RNA sequence: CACGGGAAACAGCAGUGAUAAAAAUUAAGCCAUGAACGAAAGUUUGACUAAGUUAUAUUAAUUAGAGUUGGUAAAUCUCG
RNA sequence: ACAGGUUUGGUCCUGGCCUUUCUAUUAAUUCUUAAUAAAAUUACACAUGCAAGUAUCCGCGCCCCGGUGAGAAUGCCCU
């Protein structure tokens, strides 16, 4: 809240902007995203493994 | 404290002392600690059977249905309690576990008359 | 049917206000319709009204 | 002590009367301590096994005194006359053990009415007493109950269609378990 | 509990959950039970939401609320 | 139109027979004391304070209700055979809502047998106590009401205190409340101890009991030896109200009986001991007429 | 201390003395006896018909100690202490 | 409290026992009085005795005094609507002023009792918790129930230790 | 503050160095409550439950040792 | 505070210091067994193990619980 001496945090804004930008620019093509390794049953992108029942 | 998300819920807080459990039925935010802050106290449930062989449950029915009416969510054990009371239909899982229990008694009956032989 | 206690509460509640009708209290499931889990959910963001 | 079963006897005896007079049992006893203000709770217990400790209490110095719920003439001394409250242990000077003993005794005694205390006038619990309301009075049994049926159709176990069972069997294949039939009606014991 | 940024264990690494044995009969029965039960309770829940609509509207814009308002205004003048 | 304990007739008769004794009504109580207060009054202000005190003592005198016994509650709300062996104990469900009257709360019980029934009376009261405790009630029924302890308390003549315990502990329409009030009345009758309840709020109780049980002997005799005959005649009057058709009440209509003569009427026709009544009436009449 | 004490106690004004100088009944209200007006002293001689002037707000010297006691601002660890009998 | 002219009016009791409670329409009460004149007397005693009582029970209402502006004593009340109540207090007694104000914008004893009734239904008897908010903490302390093992140690069977040492063997 | 930069993080449970007058298990379970996810049976959870350790505190008994003896302030004799 | 000791050859006054009560940590000396509660030098550095997954793929969860009191006169109560 408001205390009369409160400091102006600048970098708080900078990091928001920059993160949103690097998010939009590096936003993954779903071609590589859902790409799947059929031997290991493992996503390269997320490092996630698929549930046993879906094999 | 400020949270990101999560819903209103009716659950059991666990009060008690080691080996002697006790529960405060409670309407609380979901993301807050079990025994912690709550919105409103609803009832109490004492699991240990007393002098008369009763488990005491207390339900503030008016307030309970006020909150259900605001879309609060129930815990599986609160569901089981209401159902037992008859304020909700039996929870399917109560019924099923009952059946399983019956079949266990059956197979132990047969195993008993098989071992006796 | 209403569940056993709730039915009792409603019965007694209408006896108190002088409504004698013994017509059974009934719970209306028309709006309780829910789609099975297989039914696909819409990915489209909701317009707030 | 010879008295035992009849403790009250010792209070009417001539040696009691001789020893204590009409004063209370504790009137002449003084607790020994380090300064102006005594320690806020008395010595724990003044007899450990065979050893009787120092300058013993009013109650434990005279072994013929018995604390029961029964002798009111003894217990009466440890309650205020006017205020009907029990003296704290320092006031009298009894040891904590006997003070607790006393408290419990005076309790039992009041609970058998052998000793007097204040019973307030209280109203009745209810404003208007009417046995009319549904809660207390019999309800018109639901049409499910009269017949002998389960309150809902689905409390009862109903055998599934074979097409559906086979369908499941296809879905969960190899992860399957032994199919189970109807549940036994009533549950037997050991 | 762990955090978004706390790397998973090395043992848990090559492991994914193993689902339980399915008893087809009991399981079907159960699914029906749940569908019904949830229907009933959805009904009940709607019943109660309505009750709250009523009570709120009644203790806001209802009869005696207006009586209070008018009477107090008049007393005041 | 069978006369009831709350009928203005019977209320006025009993209020009258009770009597206001301001020294017994307001009696030093064993509670924690605080130093007294002093004010300076006229004769006027003193009379006013006394009259206020009297009105207060009226409220202190308000009779605890008398009710006939309540009917046992047996109602099954449901039977679920499926739950049968699932629990060893019973669940007891108490609606607790701050608005609801305690005679209207729902108290439900799931048994091990699976049936969901309404709670019995005693269970119900015990339960209400648990969740809405009010001082003077123990949940477990106190030892003092066993016959032994009760007899002990009658021998120290605490009868007032017993009645008060009882009013706090049990419920006026209960089985125990009625059992204990009647057993107590019975004991003040066996011993002739009636004056113990005199300026008590409990007087009309044994009045209404003795009228309906048709023992007025002891209470008439007592009332006359205390040199209160206005009360003895109010009492026979009451007896007549609650037994409109009976030989005494009818003969009092025939002979057109004045109060003292009314007591004579009753002495002749109905009362079990006419010897003591006539003798005491004799002694009172003669001795009083010669003294004043 | 003992001079002061005896002086003080000597100068007590009895209820009868008070009754007589004001010429009224002095009436004692116990708390345990309720509203019942115990009459302690009566003015031998002729009682007034005149009520005492009612002072809405009295002017009395107050001791800050008693006021502090009444309002629960005395927190001293030495005051509540359990002591032996008189 | 010793210092002061009428020390009893600095006591919590005296402040409590004054009864006026404004309606919620009242925001500002302004007193205007004089330091002299016989007529003004009552108003002065009002400022001396009751203003403290009043304020204490209406802590959110700005009260403001002005001395020797007008030839005559008065109160003015400023309400939320913009309405302005003007009360001429002239030869009126201290008491009469308090009563007349209580009459105009007070709260009926009915109102006050309803309010305090809504505040006393706030702490429910059947709940459990910290001594501050509740009558009981555990249910360990209700008569028929199972007692806090910190008092009466449990039968060995109900102990989890015993159950575990049983299942092990 | 965290784009960047020092640099490579237990102020999660246990542990350990250092440091301080200051010293709990590198333990067992998800059986109960809670939480996450699942349509669901259910799975996971060092939250927690039940245990381990410790005179820190209460209580209960199986347990006797400490301090003090000029006055305040209960209690002393003979030697050095 | 129900107070007590101590200024002086002595008395009174004024005025400090201390005693008597209650709790917690640590230490010394002593220590039999249970139960319950509580567990605390360190915002210094950390070996090893574990603390977040579920789920027919998407998704949804992942300092929420738990930890700590470093910082800030922060802030309490209330719009
Ligand atoms: Mg995933
Ligand atoms: Mg605990
Ligand atoms: Mg940072
Ligand atoms: Mg650690
Ligand atoms: Mg971390
Ligand atoms: Mg170390
Ligand atoms: Mg430590
Ligand atoms: Mg060590
Ligand atoms: Mg779990
Ligand atoms: Mg689980
Ligand atoms: Mg584990
Ligand atoms: Mg000097
Ligand atoms: Mg000297
Ligand atoms: Mg000094
Ligand atoms: Mg240590
Ligand atoms: Mg925290
Ligand atoms: Mg700073
Ligand atoms: Zn002793
Ligand atoms: Zn407990």
TrEMBL record, chain F:
GO molecular function: structural constituent of ribosome
GO cellular component: mitochondrial small ribosomal subunit
Protein name: Mitochondrial ribosomal protein S22
Naturally occurring in which organism (per UniProt): Sus scrofa
Gene, per the UniProt record: MRPS22
Full-protein positions shown: 88 to 379 of 382
TrEMBL record, chain G:
Location relative to the cell: Mitochondrion
Domain of life: Eukaryota
Family statement drawn from the similarity comment of this UniProt entry: Belongs to the universal ribosomal protein uS5 family.
Name used for this protein in its record: Small ribosomal subunit protein uS5m
Species this chain originates from: Sus scrofa (Pig)
Automatic annotation (TrEMBL), chain H:
Compartments where found: Mitochondrion
Protein name: Small ribosomal subunit protein mS25
Family statement: Belongs to the mitochondrion-specific ribosomal protein mS25 family.
Gene Ontology terms for molecular function: structural constituent of ribosome
Amino acids binding Zn(2+): 138, 140, 148
Pfam families, sorted: L51_S25_CI-B8
Gene: MRPS25
Presence of the UniProt keyword Ribonucleoprotein in the record: yes
Major subcellular site: mitochondrion
Every Ribosomal protein/NADH dehydrogenase domain range: 35-108
Record carries keyword Lyase: no
Record organism: Sus scrofa (Pig)
A GO cellular component annotation in the UniProt record: mitochondrion
């Amino acid at each position: 809240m408001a205390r009369k001496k409160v400091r102006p945090r600048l970098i708080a804004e900078l990091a928001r902007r920059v993160r949103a930008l690097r998010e939009q620019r590096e936003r993954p093509r779903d071609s590589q995203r859902y790409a799947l390794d059929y031997e290991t049953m493992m996503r390269p992108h997320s490092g996630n493994r698929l549930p046993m029942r879906a094999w | 404290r400020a949270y990101r998300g999560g819903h209103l819920t009716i659950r059991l807080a666990l009060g008690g002392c080691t080996n002697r459990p006790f529960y405060r039925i409670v309407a609380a935010h979901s993301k807050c600690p079990r025994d912690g802050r709550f919105v409103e106290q609803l009832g109490s449930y004492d699991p240990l059977p007393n002098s008369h062989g009763e488990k005491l449950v207390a339900l503030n029915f008016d307030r309970i249905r006020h909150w259900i009416g605001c879309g609060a969510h129930l815990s599986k054990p609160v569901e089981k309690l209401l159902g037992l009371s008859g304020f909700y239909p039996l929870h399917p899982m109560m019924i099923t576990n009952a059946e399983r229990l019956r079949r266990k008694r059956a197979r132990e009956v047969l195993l008993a008359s098989q071992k006796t032989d | 049917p209403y569940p056993p206690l709730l039915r009792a509460m409603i019965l007694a509640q209408r006896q108190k206000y002088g409504d004698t009708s013994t017509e059974e209290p009934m719970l209306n499931l028309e709006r309780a319709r829910i789609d099975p889990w297989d039914y696909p959910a819409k990915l489209e963001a909701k317009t707030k009204t | 002590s010879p008295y035992k079963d009849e403790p009250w006897k010792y209070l009417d005896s001539e040696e009691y009367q001789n020893r204590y007079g009409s004063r209370p049992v504790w009137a002449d006893y003084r607790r020994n301590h380090k300064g102006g203000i005594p320690p806020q709770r008395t010595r724990k217990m003044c007899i450990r096994g065979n050893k009787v400790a120092g300058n013993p209490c009013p109650i434990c110095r005279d072994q013929k005194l018995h604390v029961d719920f029964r002798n009111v003439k003894l217990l009466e001394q440890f309650v205020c006359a006017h205020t009907g409250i029990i003296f704290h242990a320092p006031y009298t000077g009894v040891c904590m053990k006997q003070h607790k003993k006393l408290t419990q005794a005076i309790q039992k005694a009041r609970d058998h009415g052998l000793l007097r205390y204040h019973i307030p006038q209280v109203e009745p619990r209810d404003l208007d007493f009417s046995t009319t309301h549904g809660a207390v009075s019999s309800t018109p049994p639901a049409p499910t109950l009269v017949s002998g049926d389960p309150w809902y159709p689905w409390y009862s176990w109903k055998q599934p269609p074979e097409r559906e069972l086979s369908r499941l069997r296809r879905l969960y294949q190899g992860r399957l378990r032994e199919e189970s039939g109807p549940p036994p009606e009533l549950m037997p014991e050991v | 509990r762990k955090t978004r940024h706390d790397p998973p264990a090395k043992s848990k690494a090559g492991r994914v959950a193993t689902p339980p044995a399915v008893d087809p009969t009991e399981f079907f029965v159960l699914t029906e039970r749940y569908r019904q039960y949830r229907q009933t309770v959805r009904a009940l829940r709607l019943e109660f939401m309505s009750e709250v609509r009523k009570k709120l509207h009644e203790a806001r814009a209802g009869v005696q609320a207006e009586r209070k308002a008018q009477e107090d205004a008049a007393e005041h003048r | 139109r069978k006369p009831t304990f709350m009928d203005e007739e019977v209320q006025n008769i009993l209020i009258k027979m009770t009597g206001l004794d301001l020294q017994k009504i307001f009696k030093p109580a064993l509670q924690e004391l605080k130093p007294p207060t002093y004010k300076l009054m006229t004769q006027a202000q003193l009379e006013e304070a006394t009259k206020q005190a009297v009105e207060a003592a009226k409220v202190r005198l308000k009779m605890p209700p008398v009710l006939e016994e309540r009917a046992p509650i047996n109602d099954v709300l449901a039977e679920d055979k499926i739950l049968e062996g699932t629990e060893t104990a019973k669940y007891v469900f108490t609606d607790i809502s701050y608005s609801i009257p305690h005679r209207e709360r729902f108290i439900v019980v799931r048994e091990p047998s699976g049936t969901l029934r309404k709670a019995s009376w005693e269970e119900r009261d015990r339960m209400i106590q648990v969740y809405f405790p009010r001082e003077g009630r123990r949940i477990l029924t106190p030892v003092i009401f066993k016959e032994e302890n009760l007899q002990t308390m009658y021998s120290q003549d605490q009868h007032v205190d017993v009645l008060n315990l009882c009013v706090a502990q049990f419920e006026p329409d209960s089985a125990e409340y009625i059992k204990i009030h009647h057993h107590t009345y019975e004991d003040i009758d066996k011993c002739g101890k009636y004056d113990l309840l005199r300026s008590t709020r409990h007087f009309g109780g044994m009045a209404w009991y003795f009228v309906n049980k048709k023992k007025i002997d002891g209470l008439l005799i007592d009332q006359i030896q205390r040199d209160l005959v206005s009360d003895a005649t109010s009492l026979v009057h009451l007896y007549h109200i609650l037994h409109p058709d009976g030989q005494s009440a009818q003969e009092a209509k025939k002979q057109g009986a004045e109060g003292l003569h009314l007591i004579k009427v009753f002495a002749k026709t109905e009362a079990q001991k006419g010897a003591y009544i006539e003798l005491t009436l004799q002694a009172y009449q003669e001795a009083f007429i010669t003294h004043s | 201390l003992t001079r002061g004490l005896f002086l003080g106690l000597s100068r007590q004004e009895t209820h009868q003395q008070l009754a007589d100088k004001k010429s009224l009944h002095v009436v004692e209200f116990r708390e345990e006896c309720g509203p019942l007006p115990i009459v302690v002293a009566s003015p031998q001689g002729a009682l007034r018909k005149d009520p005492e002037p009612e002072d809405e707000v009295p002017d009395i010297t107050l001791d800050w100690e008693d006021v502090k006691a009444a309002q629960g601002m005395k927190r001293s660890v030495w005051s509540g202490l359990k002591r032996a009998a008189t | 409290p010793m210092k002061g002219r009428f020390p009893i009016r600095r006591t919590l009791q005296y402040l409590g026992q004054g009864d006026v409670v404004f309606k919620d329409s009242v925001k500002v009460m302004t007193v205007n009085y004089n330091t002299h004149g016989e007529l003004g007397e009552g108003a002065r005693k009002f400022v001396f005795f009751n203003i403290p009582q009043i304020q204490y029970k209406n802590p959110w209402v700005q009260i403001t005094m002005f001395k020797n502006m007008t030839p005559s004593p008065f109160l003015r009340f400023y309400l939320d609507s913009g309405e302005q109540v003007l009360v001429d207090v002239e030869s009126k007694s201290n008491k009469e002023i308090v009563e007349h104000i209580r009459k105009i914008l007070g709260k009926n004893e009915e109102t006050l009792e309803k309010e305090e009734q809504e505040k006393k239904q706030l702490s429910h008897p059947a709940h459990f918790g910290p001594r501050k908010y509740c009558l009981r903490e555990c249910m360990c302390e209700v008569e028929g129930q199972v007692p806090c093992p910190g008092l009466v140690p449990l039968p060995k069977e109900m102990t989890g230790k015993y159950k575990a040492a049983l299942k092990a063997t």
